[PDB]
Enzyme design. Structure first.
Site, PDB file in Angstrom:
ATOM      1  N   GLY A 269       0.988  -0.808   0.075  1.00 29.18           N
ATOM      2  CA  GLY A 269       0.028  -0.075   0.000  1.00 29.18           C
ATOM      3  C   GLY A 269       1.024   1.538   0.276  1.00 29.18           C
ATOM      4  CB  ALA A 270       1.200   4.454  -2.027  1.00 29.88           C
ATOM      5  CD  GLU A 272      -0.249   8.558   3.425  1.00 32.37           C
ATOM      6  OE1 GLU A 272      -0.852   8.367   4.810  1.00 32.37           O
ATOM      7  OE2 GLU A 272      -0.166   7.603   3.373  1.00 32.37           O
ATOM      8  CG  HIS A 305      -2.922  11.478  -2.276  1.00 29.43           C
ATOM      9  ND1 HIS A 305      -3.761  11.830  -2.200  1.00 29.43           N
ATOM     10  CD2 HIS A 305      -2.974   9.870  -1.626  1.00 29.43           C
ATOM     11  CE1 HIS A 305      -5.166  11.308  -1.507  1.00 29.43           C
ATOM     12  NE2 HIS A 305      -4.264  10.051  -0.749  1.00 29.43           N
ATOM     13  CD  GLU A 306       0.454   7.541  -0.444  1.00 22.45           C
ATOM     14  OE1 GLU A 306       0.652   7.722   0.523  1.00 22.45           O
ATOM     15  OE2 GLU A 306      -1.008   7.678  -0.548  1.00 22.45           O
TER      16      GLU A 306
HETATM   17  C1  LIG Z   1      -4.285   7.700  -5.874  1.00 19.46           C
HETATM   18  O1  LIG Z   1      -3.154   6.992  -5.618  1.00 19.46           O
HETATM   19  C2  LIG Z   1      -3.471   7.081  -4.499  1.00 19.46           C
HETATM   20  C3  LIG Z   1      -4.238   7.254  -3.400  1.00 19.46           C
HETATM   21  C4  LIG Z   1      -4.913   7.336  -1.825  1.00 19.46           C
HETATM   22  C5  LIG Z   1      -3.614   5.605  -1.299  1.00 19.46           C
HETATM   23  C6  LIG Z   1      -3.580   5.737   0.142  1.00 19.46           C
HETATM   24  C7  LIG Z   1      -3.189   4.855   0.961  1.00 19.46           C
HETATM   25  C8  LIG Z   1      -3.755   4.510   1.823  1.00 19.46           C
HETATM   26  O2  LIG Z   1      -3.471   3.112   2.017  1.00 19.46           O
HETATM   27  C9  LIG Z   1      -4.858   2.889   3.215  1.00 19.46           C
HETATM   28  C10 LIG Z   1      -4.924   1.567   3.207  1.00 19.46           C
HETATM   29  O3  LIG Z   1      -4.127   1.116   1.978  1.00 19.46           O
HETATM   30  N1  LIG Z   1      -5.274   0.964   4.885  1.00 19.46           N
HETATM   31  C11 LIG Z   1      -5.685   1.514   5.622  1.00 19.46           C
HETATM   32  C12 LIG Z   1      -5.717  -0.453   4.286  1.00 19.46           C
HETATM   33  C13 LIG Z   1      -6.811  -1.880   5.015  1.00 19.46           C
HETATM   34  C14 LIG Z   1      -7.821  -1.031   4.674  1.00 19.46           C
HETATM   35  C15 LIG Z   1      -9.327  -1.846   4.819  1.00 19.46           C
HETATM   36  C16 LIG Z   1      -8.790  -3.195   5.335  1.00 19.46           C
HETATM   37  N2  LIG Z   1      -7.406  -3.438   5.454  1.00 19.46           N
HETATM   38  C17 LIG Z   1      -6.811  -2.262   5.040  1.00 19.46           C
HETATM   39  C18 LIG Z   1      -4.965  -3.546   5.693  1.00 19.46           C
HETATM   40  N3  LIG Z   1      -4.271   5.430   2.698  1.00 19.46           N
HETATM   41  C19 LIG Z   1      -3.510   6.590   2.249  1.00 19.46           C
HETATM   42  N4  LIG Z   1      -4.228   7.777   3.185  1.00 19.46           N
HETATM   43  N5  LIG Z   1      -2.778   8.629   4.168  1.00 19.46           N
HETATM   44  C20 LIG Z   1      -4.022   9.825   5.052  1.00 19.46           C
HETATM   45  C21 LIG Z   1      -3.347  11.059   5.229  1.00 19.46           C
HETATM   46  C22 LIG Z   1      -5.514   9.260   5.260  1.00 19.46           C
HETATM   47  C23 LIG Z   1      -5.531   8.106   4.376  1.00 19.46           C
HETATM   48  C24 LIG Z   1      -6.384   7.792   4.138  1.00 19.46           C
HETATM   49  N6  LIG Z   1      -3.925   6.822   0.484  1.00 19.46           N
HETATM   50  C25 LIG Z   1      -2.839   5.638  -2.221  1.00 19.46           C
HETATM   51  C26 LIG Z   1      -2.711   5.452  -3.869  1.00 19.46           C
HETATM   52 ZN   LIG Z   2      -3.505   9.305   0.719  1.00 16.11          ZN
END
Ligand SMILES: COc1ccc(-c2cc(OCC(=O)N(C)Cc3cccnc3C)nc(-n3nc(C)cc3C)n2)cc1
Ligand SMILES: [Zn+2]
Ligand SMILES: *[C@@H]1O[C@H](CO)[C@@H](O[C@@H]2O[C@H](CO)[C@@H](O[C@@H]3O[C@H](CO)[C@@H](O)[C@H](O[C@H]4O[C@H](CO)[C@@H](O)[C@H](O)[C@@H]4O)[C@@H]3O)[C@H](O)[C@H]2NC(C)=O)[C@H](O)[C@H]1NC(C)=O
Ligand SMILES: *[C@@H]1O[C@H](CO)[C@@H](O[C@@H]2O[C@H](CO)[C@@H](O[C@@H]3O[C@H](CO)[C@@H](O)[C@H](O[C@H]4O[C@H](CO)[C@@H](O)[C@H](O)[C@@H]4O)[C@@H]3O)[C@H](O)[C@H]2NC(C)=O)[C@H](O)[C@H]1NC(C)=O
Ligand SMILES: *[C@@H]1O[C@H](CO)[C@@H](O[C@@H]2O[C@H](CO)[C@@H](O[C@@H]3O[C@H](CO)[C@@H](O)[C@H](O)[C@@H]3O)[C@H](O)[C@H]2NC(C)=O)[C@H](O)[C@H]1NC(C)=O
Ligand SMILES: *[C@@H]1O[C@H](CO)[C@@H](O[C@@H]2O[C@H](CO)[C@@H](O[C@@H]3O[C@H](CO)[C@@H](O)[C@H](O)[C@@H]3O)[C@H](O)[C@H]2NC(C)=O)[C@H](O)[C@H]1NC(C)=O
Ligand SMILES: *[C@@H]1O[C@H](CO)[C@@H](O[C@@H]2O[C@H](CO)[C@@H](O[C@@H]3O[C@H](CO)[C@@H](O)[C@H](O)[C@@H]3O)[C@H](O)[C@H]2NC(C)=O)[C@H](O)[C@H]1NC(C)=O
Ligand SMILES: *[C@@H]1O[C@H](CO)[C@@H](O[C@@H]2O[C@H](CO)[C@@H](O)[C@H](O)[C@H]2NC(C)=O)[C@H](O)[C@H]1NC(C)=O
Ligand SMILES: *[C@@H]1O[C@H](CO)[C@@H](O)[C@H](O)[C@H]1NC(C)=O
Ligand SMILES: *[C@@H]1O[C@H](CO)[C@@H](O)[C@H](O)[C@H]1NC(C)=O
Ligand SMILES: *[C@@H]1O[C@H](CO)[C@@H](O)[C@H](O)[C@H]1NC(C)=O
Ligand SMILES: *[C@@H]1O[C@H](CO)[C@@H](O)[C@H](O)[C@H]1NC(C)=O
Ligand SMILES: *[C@@H]1O[C@H](CO)[C@@H](O)[C@H](O)[C@H]1NC(C)=O
Ligand SMILES: *[C@@H]1O[C@H](CO)[C@@H](O)[C@H](O)[C@H]1NC(C)=O
Ligand SMILES: *[C@@H]1O[C@H](CO)[C@@H](O)[C@H](O)[C@H]1NC(C)=O
EC number: 3.4.11.3
Length: 857
Positions: A269-270, A272, A305-306
């Protein structure tokens, strides 16, 4: 017996400092370590409650902080919400800080959630290894026991064991690098800033570095040695952005380090995590040759974004998961705003508008829930990470920057940052900032509370009479609604060459706007900067259509597409006869801008692919011809090259795929030659990147081409090209092969299980596998439920794709019946009720408009 029977942690005890010891065997996949943490309680509490998932707690020591003595403290776990309790012998007093240290043994994560382990093949047969952590949706309960809630922020130091080859890394720069006994090193890092639980990050792997520090700011794009050379556009971009995002925000990066990794896997996952910005391998790799502009856009976008998160979402950290859209919606806007300011050539507005278009046609469903929604359990947390919230918030902020002045927006941000920096906030705290920054304390951001608290988007009906154009807000409805403060915008040219472009605001069910002059054509939501659809009276529409026939460029390329998406979706609910929509797009013979064409082809094809599965194959063949005939001159002028505007090149990619996928013109002929030439090379010749996918698909029909292609997917490492092939492999017409690819991917024999959603999606769109895709899902659902979560984005994308083209009541009965028999929990899922709604609406599209088009001949 556990005292806190509430999901949210106690608001009493509070953490101040964090230090962490950890031993990662990796080979064993087992790890033991120690916690070091500081607490300054603010209310008298005999018991302390903290988060903890699955460890071997050995010893439990309390510090009174009066002496160096520690004290045994019986420990209790609840785990349902996921908590641990310390029954301190000495009760706690406000300002009487104590010391939190504990020791745990545990197993490293098999999944990719928490502190996890993954093995990867070398260039040699060396099975090298790698570890890291991802705990954003409250997962750092496991690993170091702690206060997972993003409110309880703190400073973090972390010390872990390593081996000499493994280049270990973390959020903060490195300090102590001793050499311990057993030939094993214990690298240490500085104290982190005040930060939340989820932004922490530990990583241990064999990686090289490419660095280019600037202005007292060190940038490093770590990666596995097999690359460390394809990571140049990242550095060129990540540097240039950190200047831009520094200038707008008027705050410098607090740390001195910025480390952008490259997790060598695909189930990544991407995130930050501060300092070390995790990324998937292939998310960042790019060559100035070979890779497509779309490939370049993702790296120049997924960075931004990140990247901006390091400020918004990391300094300012949301108190709870109510406003995860506050973080995501903000930086996603910054993506398509950062790109507009610096990388303007990328034409990223075309990517923004499409997503907002696609966003609206999913928000206009009853399954949609309000952006701000109460959160009280784990499924409610993870359900909040839906991609719709990230983009709807991206639209609302843009609407605000469109209304209030852009510099007013920037002045609003910096005060929002600096005032509440290094701290938790709520969504309202962003709004309060806007009112202060506004020249009048009027325009209270309550306007935003209209949308944040209610599902759906407004529908605006505009009827104009002379120098008075009226308005009538109304809910987008399928054949509540508590108002919408609507930043209306409009343009008129009523006297010849008279140019009027203004703004307004509607807080009522009705409203009218005065016109300085009598105007002839008028538009609304200029460049679609706002979250609304604009109806016109029958005459009011017919005015605007004529302008597209004469000088269609008096509007913007953004504006035209907003009309074309708006009018087509309206006729699909019988709110306008469909014929006028095609009457609108009869100007498309004289358009030279990519976004007007892209959206039209989407709506045209959707009818084609919709009508086809029903059986009116003749009619859809006639329909696509007329679209071809309009844009035919544009198709003939295109060159089969990789040359042009990145915008312009995108138009080439779409238009050609239209002509080839409908066998229109010599597109077929000019392609097959190329595939024959490319296949002759053993895959060793230049295929133009923009036309690569079209050409692969044109050949795969031949059993020679499909056989040639399947071997190349299993060999080369250009996964972008690799996935581009896999699309074409499922665009065949031998149903036998289509069952193989799906069946193969499900067991992941010669493919991987992740790519399955690409096929079941891909096989379904094309008529041959339409009924095949649904049957694979139906007959292989339990493995789809064993090999994926029940609410996974995989599951939702699969269920929608296997069903989104159905349009018979019989099919709908089969769909709802299958899920209902499976389980009640399966039936109440978002992915199903949405899809059932689509099939119902699809039926109405036929009922409202099928017979009239049958006469359109
Ligand atoms: C288009 O390009 C992009 C846009 C966005 C992202 C991105 C990815 C990310 O990962 C969230 C994540 O994968 N899980 C919490 C894991 C999970 C979720 C549900 C069930 N089980 C599990 C293990 N989180 C974020 N961010 N960042 C902030 C500050 C807040 C968030 C939500 N962005 C990547 C690339
Ligand atoms: Zn994000
Ligand atoms: C990957 O990261 C490594 C981390 O070191 C990085 O190595 C770089 O090596 C160059 C070699 O020239 C370093 O250059 C510096 O030059 C200055 C003066 O101009 C020196 O001060 C540096 O240290 C010397 O002086 C110190 C005085 O206190 C001594 O204590 C020390 O022992 C040295 O004698 C050093 O010579 C450069 O600092 C590092 N770091 C970086 C970020 O460049 C390597 O470059 C990175 N990989 C890539 C591809 O860049
Ligand atoms: C130019 O457009 C503007 C919009 O900015 C508009 O000015 C508005 O005109 C209406 C005229 O109906 C005004 O509406 C009234 O506002 C007062 C405010 O206290 C209300 O009390 C009124 O209540 C009722 O009045 C009628 C019965 O007598 C009802 O039929 C009506 O529906 C109301 O229920 C009424 O709402 C409004 O205040 C102004 N606003 C401003 C800023 O001028 C105007 O129509 C356009 N220009 C012209 C010259 O007409
Ligand atoms: C995890 O625990 C395992 C033991 O279960 C550790 O395995 C040891 O790993 C080291 C290298 O990581 C091995 O040393 C190497 O030996 C070769 C051959 O003699 C030598 O050429 C190398 O230079 C290196 O010294 C060691 O042999 C191996 N243990 C055994 C019993 O074979 C592992 O290091 C632990 N990992 C961590 C991160 O602590
Ligand atoms: C800096 O941060 C502080 C808080 O740390 C901000 O204070 C907040 O300011 C707004 C300004 O209007 C207050 O709004 C008012 O709140 C009361 C109570 O809800 C309400 O009755 C009023 O109608 C109005 O909405 C707000 O209460 C206040 N505190 C909180 C906790 O929200 C301040 O605005 C920030 N900005 C600057 C430039 O100082
Ligand atoms: C797509 O086709 C349209 C057809 O009109 C092109 O519009 C033309 O754009 C050019 C370049 O801006 C204009 O040239 C200059 O326009 C200014 C007014 O903005 C004028 O003062 C100059 O004397 C000169 O004409 C041109 O006027 C305009 N066409 C008309 C009829 O006004 C558009 O540029 C094309 N886009 C692409 C990417 O090819
Ligand atoms: C590590 O994972 C194992 C896997 O279940 C956890 O449980 C042990 O599992 C093995 C293998 O099935 C059993 O033979 C043992 O009886 C289990 N017990 C113990 C005490 O480990 C194990 O709990 C995990 N490690 C920790 C520290 O929880
Ligand atoms: C964990 O700690 C317990 C405490 O009783 C100890 O008995 C055990 O050896 C440890 N190891 C495992 C694998 O649980
Ligand atoms: C520790 O507690 C004292 C009072 O006992 C308080 O004044 C101080 O702010 C606290 N600070 C730290 C760094 O623990
Ligand atoms: C460094 O910072 C100064 C002040 O903001 C600015 O003038 C300069 O352009 C910056 N240069 C780089 C490469 O960041
Ligand atoms: C491909 O990229 C390399 C590396 O930047 C560059 O040197 C080369 O000129 C490019 N190839 C061509 C044919 O231009
Ligand atoms: C619409 O969704 C809400 C939940 O957001 C639900 O309570 C209601 O029953 C749904 N209504 C229809 C007609 O689907
Ligand atoms: C297709 O080939 C024929 C060969 O006679 C040619 O006349 C025609 O111009 C070609 N295609 C296009 C798009 O012109
Ligand atoms: C063709 O390429 C494949 C993959 O690299 C290789 O296995 C094969 O030996 C090559 N054959 C020739 C004739 O180049």
């Amino acid at each position: 017996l556990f005292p806190w029977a509430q999901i949210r942690l106690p608001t009493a005890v509070v953490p101040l400092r964090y230090e962490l010891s950890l031993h990662p065997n990796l080979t064993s996949m087992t790890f033991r370590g120690s916690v070091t943490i500081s607490v300054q309680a603010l209310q008298v509490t005999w018991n302390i409650i903290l988060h903890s998932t699955g460890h071997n707690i050995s010893r439990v020591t309390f510090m009174s902080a009066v002496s160096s003595q520690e004290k045994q403290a019986e420990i209790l776990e609840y785990a349902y919400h996921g908590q641990i309790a310390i029954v301190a012998p000495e009760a706690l007093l406000a300002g009487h800080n104590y010391t939190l240290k504990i020791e745990y043994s545990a197993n490293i994560s098999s999944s990719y959630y928490g502190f996890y382990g993954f093995s990867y093949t070398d260039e040699s047969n060396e099975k090298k290894y790698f570890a890291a952590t991802q705990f954003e949706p409250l997962a750092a309960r496991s690993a170091f026991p702690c206060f997972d809630e993003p409110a309880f922020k703190a400073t973090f130091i972390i010390k872990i064991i390593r081996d000499e080859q493994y280049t270990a890394l973390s959020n903060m720069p490195k300090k102590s690098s001793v050499v311990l006994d057993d030939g094993l090193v214990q690298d240490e890092f500085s104290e982190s800033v005040k930060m939340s639980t989820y932004l922490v990050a530990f990583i241990v792997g064999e990686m090289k570095n490419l660095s280019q520090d600037v202005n007292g700011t060190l940038v490093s794009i770590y990666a596995v040695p097999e690359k460390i050379g394809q990571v140049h556009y990242a550095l060129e971009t990540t540097v240039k952005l950190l200047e831009f995002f520094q200038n707008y925000f008027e705050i410098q990066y607090p740390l001195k380090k910025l480390d952008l990794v490259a997790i060598p896997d695909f189930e990544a996952g991407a995130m930050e995590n501060w300092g070390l910005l995790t990324f998937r391998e292939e998310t960042l790799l790019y060559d100035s040759n070979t890779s497509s502009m779309a490939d370049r856009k993702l790296v120049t976008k997924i960075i931004a974004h990140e990247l901006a998160h390091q400020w918004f979402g990391n300094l300012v950290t949301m108190k709870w998961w109510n406003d995860l859209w506050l973080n995501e919606g903000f930086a996603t806007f910054m993506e398509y705003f950062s790109l507009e300011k610096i990388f303007k050539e990328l034409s990223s507005y075309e990517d923004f508008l499409d997503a907002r278009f696609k966003t609206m046609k999913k928000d206009s469903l009853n399954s949609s829930h309000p952006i701000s929604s109460s959160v009280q359990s784990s499924e409610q947390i993870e359900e909040m990470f839906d991609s719709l919230s990230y983009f709807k918030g991206s639209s609302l902020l843009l609407m605000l920057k469109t209304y209030l002045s852009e510099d007013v927006f920037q002045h609003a941000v910096v005060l929002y940052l600096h005032n509440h920096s290094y701290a938790s906030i709520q969504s309202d705290d962003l709004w309060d900032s806007f009112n202060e920054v506004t020249n009048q304390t009027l325009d209270v951001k309550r306007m935003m509370k209209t949308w944040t608290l209610q599902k759906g988007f407004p529908l605006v009906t505009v009827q104009k009479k002379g120098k008075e154009l009226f308005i009538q807000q109304e809910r987008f409805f399928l054949n509540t609604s508590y108002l919408w403060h609507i930043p209306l915008s409009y343009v008129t040219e009523g006297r010849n060459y008279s140019k009027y472009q203004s703004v307004s605001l509607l807080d009522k069910k009705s409203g009218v706007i005065n016109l300085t002059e009598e105007v002839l054509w008028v538009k609304v939501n200029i460049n679609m900067n706002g979250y609304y659809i604009v109806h016109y009276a029958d005459d009011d529409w017919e005015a605007l259509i004529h302008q597209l026939k004469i000088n269609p460029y008096v509007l913007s390329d953004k504006d035209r597409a907003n009309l074309i998406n708006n009018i087509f979706e309206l006729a699909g609910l019988g709110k306008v006869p469909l014929k006028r929509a095609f009457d609108l797009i009869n100007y498309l013979g004289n358009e030279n801008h990519t976004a007007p064409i892209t959206e039209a082809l989407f709506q045209t094809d959707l009818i084609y692919n919709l009508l086809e599965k029903l059986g009116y194959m003749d009619l859809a063949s006639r329909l696509v011809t007329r679209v071809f005939k309009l844009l035919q001159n544009q198709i003939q002028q295109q060159t089969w090259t990789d040359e042009g505007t990145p915008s312009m090149r995108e138009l080439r990619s779409a238009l050609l795929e239209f002509a080839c996928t409908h066998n229109l013109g010599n597109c077929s002929t000019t392609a097959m030659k190329l595939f024959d030439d490319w296949m002759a090379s053993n895959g060793t010749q230049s295929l133009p990147t923009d036309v690569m996918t079209t050409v692969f698909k044109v050949g795969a029909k031949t059993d020679k081409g499909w056989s040639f292609l399947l071997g190349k997917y299993i060999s080369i490492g250009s996964e972008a090209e690799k996935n581009k092939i896999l699309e074409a492999l499922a665009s065949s017409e031998d149903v036998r092969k289509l069952y193989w690819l799906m069946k193969s991917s499900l067991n992941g024999d010669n493919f991987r299980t992740q790519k399955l959603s690409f096929i079941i999606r891909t096989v379904g769109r094309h008529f041959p596998g339409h009924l095949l895709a649904w049957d694979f899902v139906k007959e292989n659902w339990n493995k789809l439920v064993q090999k994926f979560p029940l609410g996974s984005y995989t599951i939702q994308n699969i269920v929608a794709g296997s069903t989104y083209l159905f349009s018979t009541k019989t099919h709908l009965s089969e769909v709802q019946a299958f899920f209902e028999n499976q389980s009640e929990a399966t039936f109440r899922l978002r992915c199903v009720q949405e899809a059932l709604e689509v099939i119902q609406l699809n039926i109405q599209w036929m009922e409202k408009n099928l017979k009239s088009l049958t006469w359109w001949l």
